[PDB]
Design an enzyme around this catalytic site. Sequence first.
Site, mmCIF file in Angstrom:
data_model
loop_
_atom_site.group_PDB
_atom_site.id
_atom_site.type_symbol
_atom_site.label_atom_id
_atom_site.label_comp_id
_atom_site.label_asym_id
_atom_site.label_seq_id
_atom_site.Cartn_x
_atom_site.Cartn_y
_atom_site.Cartn_z
ATOM 1 N N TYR A 75 -3.036 -16.148 26.374
ATOM 2 C CA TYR A 75 -2.765 -14.747 26.663
ATOM 3 C C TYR A 75 -3.777 -14.197 27.650
ATOM 4 C CZ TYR A 75 -2.125 -9.714 25.901
ATOM 5 O OH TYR A 75 -1.871 -8.373 26.048
ATOM 6 N N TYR A 113 4.909 -8.693 18.106
ATOM 7 C CA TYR A 113 5.608 -7.794 19.003
ATOM 8 C C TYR A 113 6.981 -8.400 19.282
ATOM 9 C CZ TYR A 113 1.056 -5.528 20.283
ATOM 10 O OH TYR A 113 -0.128 -4.836 20.279
ATOM 11 N N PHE A 127 -6.041 -9.874 11.281
ATOM 12 C CA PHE A 127 -4.830 -9.077 11.354
ATOM 13 C C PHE A 127 -4.044 -9.397 12.604
ATOM 14 C CE2 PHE A 127 -1.982 -5.458 11.450
ATOM 15 C CZ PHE A 127 -1.844 -5.045 10.139
ATOM 16 N N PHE A 161 -6.698 -7.661 14.859
ATOM 17 C CA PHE A 161 -8.094 -8.077 14.852
ATOM 18 C C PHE A 161 -8.197 -9.600 14.866
ATOM 19 C CE2 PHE A 161 -8.103 -4.123 12.187
ATOM 20 C CZ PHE A 161 -8.473 -3.301 13.229
ATOM 21 N N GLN A 219 -1.257 2.901 10.255
ATOM 22 C CA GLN A 219 -1.052 3.040 8.824
ATOM 23 C C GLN A 219 -2.309 3.425 8.010
ATOM 24 O OE1 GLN A 219 -2.300 0.488 6.714
ATOM 25 N NE2 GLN A 219 -1.120 0.693 4.832
ATOM 26 N N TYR A 258 -9.842 2.085 24.087
ATOM 27 C CA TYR A 258 -9.835 3.535 23.887
ATOM 28 C C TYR A 258 -11.053 4.293 24.448
ATOM 29 C CZ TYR A 258 -6.305 2.413 20.312
ATOM 30 O OH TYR A 258 -5.229 1.910 19.623
ATOM 31 N N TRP A 293 -9.793 3.297 15.651
ATOM 32 C CA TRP A 293 -9.084 2.990 14.398
ATOM 33 C C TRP A 293 -9.960 3.097 13.150
ATOM 34 C CZ3 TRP A 293 -9.950 -0.454 18.363
ATOM 35 C CH2 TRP A 293 -10.887 -1.451 18.104
ATOM 36 N N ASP A 300 -4.730 4.729 25.248
ATOM 37 C CA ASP A 300 -5.503 3.536 25.490
ATOM 38 C C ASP A 300 -5.340 3.036 26.935
ATOM 39 O OD1 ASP A 300 -2.833 2.368 24.377
ATOM 40 O OD2 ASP A 300 -3.875 0.689 25.278
ATOM 41 N N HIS A 337 -5.580 -6.187 33.082
ATOM 42 C CA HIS A 337 -4.401 -5.348 33.249
ATOM 43 C C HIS A 337 -4.658 -4.151 34.144
ATOM 44 C CE1 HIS A 337 -2.507 -7.187 29.396
ATOM 45 N NE2 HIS A 337 -1.862 -7.649 30.453
ATOM 46 N N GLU A 349 0.818 -1.202 0.000
ATOM 47 C CA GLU A 349 0.000 0.000 0.000
ATOM 48 C C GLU A 349 0.869 1.277 0.000
ATOM 49 O OE1 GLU A 349 -3.035 -0.638 3.090
ATOM 50 O OE2 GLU A 349 -3.571 -2.452 1.992
ATOM 51 N N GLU A 401 -2.415 -7.720 -3.169
ATOM 52 C CA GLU A 401 -1.737 -6.451 -2.947
ATOM 53 C C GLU A 401 -0.232 -6.582 -3.226
ATOM 54 O OE1 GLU A 401 -2.921 -3.914 0.281
ATOM 55 O OE2 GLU A 401 -4.981 -4.685 0.273
ATOM 56 N N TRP A 410 4.272 0.837 25.418
ATOM 57 C CA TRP A 410 3.990 -0.533 25.746
ATOM 58 C C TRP A 410 5.290 -1.339 26.025
ATOM 59 C CZ3 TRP A 410 0.068 -2.957 27.650
ATOM 60 C CH2 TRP A 410 -0.176 -4.315 27.409
ATOM 61 N N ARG A 467 -11.330 -8.338 -0.115
ATOM 62 C CA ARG A 467 -11.946 -7.414 0.814
ATOM 63 C C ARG A 467 -12.081 -6.051 0.162
ATOM 64 N NH1 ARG A 467 -6.965 -5.239 4.832
ATOM 65 N NH2 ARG A 467 -5.763 -4.619 2.986
ATOM 66 N N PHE A 487 0.205 4.339 23.003
ATOM 67 C CA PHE A 487 1.063 3.223 22.577
ATOM 68 C C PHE A 487 2.335 3.738 21.869
ATOM 69 C CE2 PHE A 487 1.635 -0.209 19.221
ATOM 70 C CZ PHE A 487 1.828 -1.318 20.091
ATOM 71 N N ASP A 496 -4.925 0.046 28.142
ATOM 72 C CA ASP A 496 -3.865 -0.956 28.327
ATOM 73 C C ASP A 496 -2.526 -0.327 28.687
ATOM 74 O OD1 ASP A 496 -3.952 -3.674 28.537
ATOM 75 O OD2 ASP A 496 -3.388 -4.122 26.490
ATOM 76 N N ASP A 497 -2.086 0.598 27.840
ATOM 77 C CA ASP A 497 -0.863 1.332 28.067
ATOM 78 C C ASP A 497 -0.936 2.151 29.361
ATOM 79 O OD1 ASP A 497 1.177 1.069 25.910
ATOM 80 O OD2 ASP A 497 -0.554 1.343 24.640
ATOM 81 N N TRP A 504 -6.171 -8.966 22.287
ATOM 82 C CA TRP A 504 -5.011 -8.265 21.727
ATOM 83 C C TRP A 504 -3.679 -9.059 21.844
ATOM 84 C CZ3 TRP A 504 -6.308 -4.002 19.083
ATOM 85 C CH2 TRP A 504 -7.427 -3.252 19.468
HETATM 86 C C1 LIG Z 1 -12.131 0.097 9.391
HETATM 87 C C2 LIG Z 1 -10.870 -0.561 9.898
HETATM 88 C C3 LIG Z 1 -11.009 -1.936 10.511
HETATM 89 C C4 LIG Z 1 -9.676 0.077 9.794
HETATM 90 C C5 LIG Z 1 -8.367 -0.531 10.280
HETATM 91 C C6 LIG Z 1 -7.721 -1.320 9.137
HETATM 92 C C7 LIG Z 1 -6.377 -1.949 9.500
HETATM 93 C C8 LIG Z 1 -5.665 -2.665 8.387
HETATM 94 C C9 LIG Z 1 -5.858 -1.876 10.739
HETATM 95 C C10 LIG Z 1 -4.531 -2.501 11.130
HETATM 96 C C11 LIG Z 1 -3.936 -1.781 12.306
HETATM 97 C C12 LIG Z 1 -4.649 -2.081 13.604
HETATM 98 C C13 LIG Z 1 -4.430 -3.403 14.315
HETATM 99 C C14 LIG Z 1 -5.418 -1.119 14.127
HETATM 100 C C15 LIG Z 1 -6.174 -1.257 15.420
HETATM 101 C C16 LIG Z 1 -5.406 -0.605 16.531
HETATM 102 C C17 LIG Z 1 -4.256 -1.466 16.961
HETATM 103 C C18 LIG Z 1 -3.085 -0.947 17.320
HETATM 104 C C19 LIG Z 1 -2.819 0.530 17.329
HETATM 105 C C20 LIG Z 1 -1.988 -1.864 17.751
HETATM 106 C C21 LIG Z 1 -1.703 -1.554 19.217
HETATM 107 C C22 LIG Z 1 -2.973 -1.887 19.991
HETATM 108 C C23 LIG Z 1 -3.450 -1.150 21.023
HETATM 109 C C24 LIG Z 1 -2.752 0.061 21.550
HETATM 110 C C25 LIG Z 1 -4.724 -1.607 21.720
HETATM 111 C C26 LIG Z 1 -4.318 -2.249 23.051
HETATM 112 C C27 LIG Z 1 -3.326 -3.397 22.789
HETATM 113 N N1 LIG Z 1 -2.411 -3.586 23.913
HETATM 114 C C28 LIG Z 1 -1.348 -2.574 23.950
HETATM 115 C C29 LIG Z 1 -1.900 -4.966 23.849
#
Ligand SMILES: CC(C)=CCC/C(C)=C/CC/C(C)=C/CC/C=C(\C)CC/C=C(\C)CCCN(C)C
Lengths: 619, 619
Positions: A486, A600, A596, A592, A253, A411, A160, A365, A442, A36, A84, A303, A118, A356, A367-368, A480
């Site tokens: 976990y 880490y 996804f 997700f 991203q 969040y 997000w 968030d 947590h 992308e 992609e 984190w 998708r 984060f 968690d952090d 997560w």
């Molecule tokens: C309409 C939609 C679905 C748009 C998103 C599309 C997409 C490709 C997303 C990929 C990126 C993604 C995982 C976004 C969600 C937010 C996740 C993060 C910031 C990673 C870090 C996670 C957090 C701080 C939440 C708490 C986790 N703990 C720290 C453990």
Amino acid sequence: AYARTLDRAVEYLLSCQKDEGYWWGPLLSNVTMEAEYVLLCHILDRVDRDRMEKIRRYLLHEQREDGTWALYPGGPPDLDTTIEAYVALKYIGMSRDEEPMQKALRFIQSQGGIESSRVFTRMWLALVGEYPWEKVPMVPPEIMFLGKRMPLNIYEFGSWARATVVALSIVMSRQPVFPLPERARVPELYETDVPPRRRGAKGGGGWIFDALDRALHGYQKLSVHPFRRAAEIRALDWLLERQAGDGSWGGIQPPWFYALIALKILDMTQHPAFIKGWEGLELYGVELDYGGWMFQASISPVWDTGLAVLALRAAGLPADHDRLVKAGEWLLDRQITVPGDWAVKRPNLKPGGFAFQFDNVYYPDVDDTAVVVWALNTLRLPDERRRRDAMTKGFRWIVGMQSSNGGWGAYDVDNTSDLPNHIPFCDFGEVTDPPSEDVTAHVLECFGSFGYDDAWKVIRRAVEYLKREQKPDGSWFGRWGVNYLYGTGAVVSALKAVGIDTREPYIQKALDWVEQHQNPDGGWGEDCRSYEDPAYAGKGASTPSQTAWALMALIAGGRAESEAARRGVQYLVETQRPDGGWDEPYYTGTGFPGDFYLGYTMYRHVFPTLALGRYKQAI
Amino acid sequence: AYARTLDRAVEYLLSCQKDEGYWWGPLLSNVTMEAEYVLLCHILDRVDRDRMEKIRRYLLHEQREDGTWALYPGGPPDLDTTIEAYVALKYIGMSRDEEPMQKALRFIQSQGGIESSRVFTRMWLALVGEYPWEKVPMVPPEIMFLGKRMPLNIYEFGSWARATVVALSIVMSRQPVFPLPERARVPELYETDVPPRRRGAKGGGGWIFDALDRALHGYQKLSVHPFRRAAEIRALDWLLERQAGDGSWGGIQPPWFYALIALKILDMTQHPAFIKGWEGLELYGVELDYGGWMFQASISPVWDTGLAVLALRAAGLPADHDRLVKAGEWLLDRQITVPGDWAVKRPNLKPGGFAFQFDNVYYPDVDDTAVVVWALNTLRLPDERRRRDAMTKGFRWIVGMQSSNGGWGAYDVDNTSDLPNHIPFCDFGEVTDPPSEDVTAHVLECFGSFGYDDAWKVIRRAVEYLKREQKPDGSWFGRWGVNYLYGTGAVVSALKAVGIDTREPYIQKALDWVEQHQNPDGGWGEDCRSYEDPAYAGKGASTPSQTAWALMALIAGGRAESEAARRGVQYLVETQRPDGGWDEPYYTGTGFPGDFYLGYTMYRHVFPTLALGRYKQAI
Ligand SMILES: CC(C)=CCC/C(C)=C/CC/C(C)=C/CC/C=C(\C)CC/C=C(\C)CCCN(C)C
Ligand SMILES: CC(C)=CCC/C(C)=C/CC/C(C)=C/CC/C=C(\C)CC/C=C(\C)CCCN(C)C
Ligand SMILES: CCCCCCCCOCCOCCOCCOCCO
Ligand SMILES: CCCCCCCCOCCOCCOCCOCCO
Ligand SMILES: CCCCCCCCOCCOCCOCCOCCO
């Protein structure tokens, strides 16, 4: 057994620390990030050819012998990801008759080609003129007129998804096309015998939203769109207001790339937001040793830092250890002092959360914030005063961010609407941010460090929530982090931290679940297939991070003397690398469920350190 | 007589060119820029001590033997300026007992002190807790709710005033106070037995606005203000949308500083707009040789470059001279292709203007555009289609920007409302941007360079405008340069350029006016006192720039062989330095008639070069 192992792990972890006091490992995901990025560079007309060649090398390195790409190491072939990657490789220079492409193609065709993919993927192709915008589900800029107590308004979406939607509401308004070079066009991705394999919205196809979509595309072809400009300006303003200090949107991203495209088609490339947003991208890129380059889906320094502090304190470093003090003083400066989108739900709640990434003030968030407040409670800093103030502020913000269920989301409070997962656009990931087991655990762990327990009503409703979501076999879900290990691990540690008697039958059925899912090598593993297969619950190749989580459940329930704990400790002892760290070629992170996944890269070192530390203190 | 003079002037101008192709000389004004920068640093809590000591050195340097500061070299003591300097000096570390401070104080007290000062000065003091906000004329955020056909809507203000008003609408809403250290307070500025000299609104005694002001102040004291927040967000969004690429607002000091304060009191110092706005300030700073530091009210690189091209071409440097080609190619990249605030009056007109600064896309001005399009018309560049393109877009943008009375203003069409001038906030400078003689002249010279003349209605209306504005003594006013010499020189050049017969009685009267104001040394000069005193009309110590403008009138009007013109050339010949440049210790630029003056440091070199060049061509 373990003292030398701990000495070495602690030494390795300390050597990973940056000079300014934080830890920060790369966050791995999948090749759609860089695929992308290549298309983004094309769209913005800013193609650095050396960077393109590094991405080519990276994409080929991530391609398995199948010719496919996956969401995780050892994962099944993913169609969206493979399309992609194929597209980006053609643009960069790979001919279609080269073996790596011929293979990728054959797979794409066997899954039903582009039509099975998708929305996001079909939308990226649409942006470069390889798929009709007419067949891309429509997010209209008029979504910005929906009020705070109205259906499908932007604050019903999770953080997000919101920022993604606003930015794309401008992009889809205009349906811009930036044609690929003729040689990079990809008609071959439609040429298949398999009829489309259509996934829809994450929960299901409701007809109302299908019809709304068709109405919105009809509306597109008219020349006059009343109030449309005003809606586009609302979207733009919302984005200008919320851009992060690092140039990104949400430190992630997707809304970052989409916002940059939105600004581009609004002719705002000379606007400072665009200039910062473009320049800020380099912070998230990583030059790889073998000659590749990658782009991080997000960045994890807060984190990683909070956890490294917690591991090194468990393992035995003092509260005032100089490198832990440098870390704690760093974390103080990260506390957020201003209202974010969470304030829609809590307009009188005082800011004190943590994000984060390095600079992401509107999206802290829980968690952090939980892990950072906790970590700072384990420390002794020369700014005595602003340390207490900081924990006070963080503590109280988490208290206030509690949802009605009893648990905490990441969040927002009460981000639990069912409506968003039924629009055709939303066929990928979670699009809401409801309470989860792991972040609740947590904050419970955080609160327990300050000496709080079940007498206080906040923790009571937290413990009940968890009990209601405990699974019938005795485990807890991982929102997560992967997965039942976990979550079960986090939860039991928390139940112990907040004074709960661990001999109760629900926690004994939990410790039995962990003890029963121990691999023959002494460790525990759990594959990402676990989000979509019951058979995979607590099942996988052993990893160091997941072993750590199981070990910490056992220790929290007073099972440090047990054979299970002793076999898990020996496993950590025996698989440690010569340098004091551990290898981990599998993802143990979750972005997700099902869609996804995250590696880490620090988990493999920090978590074994924390676990072994809890073992040392238990004896 | 003049050949060596011209050759040396050309060599000197060329030595002043930046490597990148542009010219850029510092723009001088008065010490309120730096005095306000000091208070800004105090407000943001970002005080660099070395910088403070350099500003103190500068403030002291600029102070005259009588203890006062002025708006221009040799000007009368200015109360507002002297107050702001005294306040900054006291903040930085001077004690009131020291002699420079004693003399300043004595002057300030002799004018009635702070109660006699302008609104801006009282507002800065209010910002630091030295004057009551209750007594500062209120600009409410609710101004953002006025549509473009409503009285006092922001688009009735001139561009400079518009951005100032939008930022201050946020500031005044909160009435924020950032107290000075106790030792820097200035109660002594109120201690006087001289009654307040209240020079209120610039235009006169509109009682409606004094009543509205008292009502807004009463409204301010209530605890609930319906839709105020929505108004503040409107103002914020307006600013975020319009921030320039260099971090400023409008490339000028006032809205930039006020926008930063606005962002600060909204707790937005971590927002990228603030970060870039703060960091961008350094571009406008200038370290002085004696150890001082100044801040430029604006920056003039496009204007200096356009004028240098025209001067060097007039002197006989070829159209394809490699240094002029560098400059033309640089100018091509400065053209603005996006809508600016001007599009409120002209929504279907294609963008094609140039700004004064490096990056200010929303505020092109007609003067820069006319001069740049003209300059490009004298050049032969290797990308000839891009040159023709640029000249076409710029030419047509100027045409579309013509006001109803036939002249051009700087930024807007028909910015002629008489309402902004009567509100009590507006007691300083011009607050609207109606057409002026000098900008119109420049437009006309540009048009004439392409061979257009008064067979075109656009030019006919402009010439009719210039005829109506001609003063009884035959001179024309100078809105942006000082004063009757500037306007008369521009207008006579312009009328010649578009094919008017210079023998017509009204032109001959202007030319006799020029001759009869020649100084005994052969030069011409005009003091900035000219705007406030008819006895200074066309009168002052000779300057190289003003001599150049008088000469340009004489040459345009057929009198290059006159005694007057020969004496003017000889003055220039005799006053040139060995290095090819000229000294000019007087200001010849105008910010606002009566209130703000400008030293364009390149004028003393570029204008003699242009006039000598035109003189050579005539002879
Ligand atoms: C309409 C939609 C679905 C748009 C998103 C599309 C997409 C490709 C997303 C990929 C990126 C993604 C995982 C976004 C969600 C937010 C996740 C993060 C910031 C990673 C870090 C996670 C957090 C701080 C939440 C708490 C986790 N703990 C720290 C453990
Ligand atoms: C409410 C009010 C009055 C606020 C402003 C207060 C104030 C202190 C202003 C000082 C700075 C100032 C003179 C601003 C007006 C704009 C002036 C400039 C960009 C300098 C360059 C001039 C122009 C491009 C106009 C065209 C003139 N030619 C280029 C030759
Ligand atoms: C109601 C329109 C959007 C409100 C934007 C708030 C603007 C304040 O400027 C600071 C930028 O803050 C970005 C968003 O901050 C979240 C505050 O919550 C706003 C929810 O209406
Ligand atoms: C979605 C929110 C829409 C709410 C509309 C608000 C109603 C409009 O209020 C208009 C108030 O106008 C007052 C103007 O203020 C005076 C301007 O002062 C000029 C500077 O002295
Ligand atoms: C109340 C909204 C007015 C429209 C503002 C334009 C939003 C797009 O921003 C891009 C940058 O714009 C800077 C200002 O441009 C002026 C265009 O004219 C808008 C007059 O309403």
